[PDB]
Amino acid sequence: HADGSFSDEMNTILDNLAARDFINWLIQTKITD
């Protein structure tokens, strides 16, 4: 876990790739799985 104004944004690195991993996951579920 993180704590603090910008300290919480340390994991924003993952927020970018994760945001698309999730939205795109839906597409790559039945076709790729």
Cβ neighbours of residue 11 closer than 8 Å, sequence gap 6 or more: 2
Read off φ and ψ for residue 6, nearest 5 degrees: -80, -25
What is the rounded distance in angstroms from the CA atom of residue 9 to the CA atom of residue 33? 31
d(CA 13, CA 31): 28
Measure the CA–CA gap between 12 and 7, rounded to whole angstroms. Answer: 10
Structure solved using which method?
NMR
Question: Vertex 21, ends 18 and 26: CA angle to 5°?
Answer: 140
8 Å CB contact between 9 and 15 = no
Host domain of residue 10: 1-33
Give the number of residues written for the chain: 33
> Which are the contacts of 26, defined by CB distance < 8 A and separation ≥ 6?
none
Count how many domains the chain has: 1
Please spell the DSSP secondary structure of 22-33, one letter per residue: HHHHHHTTTTT-
